[PDB]
Amino acid sequence: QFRALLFNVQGTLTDFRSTLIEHGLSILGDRVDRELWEELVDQWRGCYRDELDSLVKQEKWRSVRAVYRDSLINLLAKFSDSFCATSAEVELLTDGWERLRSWPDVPSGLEQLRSKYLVAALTNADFSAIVNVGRSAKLQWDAVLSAQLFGAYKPHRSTYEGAATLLGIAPSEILMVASHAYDLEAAREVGAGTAYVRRPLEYGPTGRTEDVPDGRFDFLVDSISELADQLGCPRLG
Amino acid sequence: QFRALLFNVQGTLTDFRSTLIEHGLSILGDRVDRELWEELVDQWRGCYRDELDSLVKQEKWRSVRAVYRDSLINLLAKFSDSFCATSAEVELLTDGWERLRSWPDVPSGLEQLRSKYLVAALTNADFSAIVNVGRSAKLQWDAVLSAQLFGAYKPHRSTYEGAATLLGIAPSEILMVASHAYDLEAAREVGAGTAYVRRPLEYGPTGRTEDVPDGRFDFLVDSISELADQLGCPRLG
């Protein structure tokens, strides 16, 4: 049925929240309490989503590192009574989004899939960021694709179409994998299969995750290894 | 000194001549003698180089699969008194360029390099072809880049520049690796370091390879593992 799996990376494969919480506390030290920094990180992810939503509607693209940097500067101003950061620290903090750690199932899940399928990233992050995340999150791909290559963010149909034509594969032979329904719904409109990965801690222990019923998408799993099993991939030794 | 190594793939890392000789003999069987098919393969590689040279001068890009297909059709006509192929076999034969095998040093050499450096392909082959070659040649990369992404073939400066800006790395911190001097000279003009890999069998046992003296490029090696040693990469177990 499928020749390749195409992955949403941030959140789907990476625990960005834990990464940015620990990264920020490492840089800022005793000047901020953990509970306060956690709140900023949650608003930071929200600002990122709000900006990409706005740029998608305007059919525009800009550097996602810049999106993260600009939203951090705005949030630092909002939190300025509580703590401060230097310009140098703004850059170091923004780097956290290029140091994401993976969920524990992900490296072995990707390896298991590759016995039968090509695996590729299709991320909204800049190309340089996802290459760096491959090292921090221990991701090995057949190909790395970024919104930067297409001048458009997911869910714009040109991202999925361009991924298909670059890979030389029909959309019906691509399985889109994500912990976000918006991405799967958009891939399905281009012709791709859909696999939803539940990430109940993506927004934290007291966080808010989507509710996806069985049957909405082609697969509904709790880990990448489970998806590999359901696709008939033999287990690793 | 360097953050990433950027690789010429066909020839530099892959024995395309042996691949296409055995691939063609597998498809065509007893209808062609090995010595005759070898001659076609050598002319086929030459036709590919002649066409890319022509397209570079015209500042044009087209599918490299189409370049290989069109040149094969021309050569089949030239050799038509000796043997024939069907349209279906033209496609199967053209597929050989996406099934290239690596030189024996290459998979472990790339793995050794990755302890210290990002490694990426920068190939003139289409994106889909180099993804397929990663499986046949056992190549694992941090990123895959193709002339198709830039609408221009190497040696056009926009390929090296675009690779640098996509990776987020200064050209002076990129080491270009190739068994072809034209590619290294062009990368050097953009600011990259240069590593020449001798491949004395690239054009066959009685084949013609360049003569490169010590000092022309930053490194001059006989294998990727040797390059890794010279870059201070610890050996594999």
Residue numbers in the entry:
A (entry chain A), B (entry chain A): 11 to 247
Provide text from the study.
RhCESH[L]-D18N was first used to capture the complex structure of CESH[L]s and CES because D18 was proposed to be the nucleophilic attacking residue in previous studies. However, sulfate ions, from the crystallizing solutions, were observed in the catalytic pockets of RhCESH[L] after the co-crystallization with CES. The residues involved in sulfate ion binding, including D18N, Q20, T133, N134, K164, and Y192 from the core domain, as well as R55 and R59 from the cap domain, formed a polar substrate binding pocket that was well-suited for binding small, highly hydrophilic molecules. Activity assays revealed a decrease in RhCESH[L] activity with increasing sulfate ion concentration, indicating that sulfate ions can compete for the binding site during catalysis. However, the binding of non-catalytic ligands, including sulfate ions and products L-TA, did not cause significant structural changes.
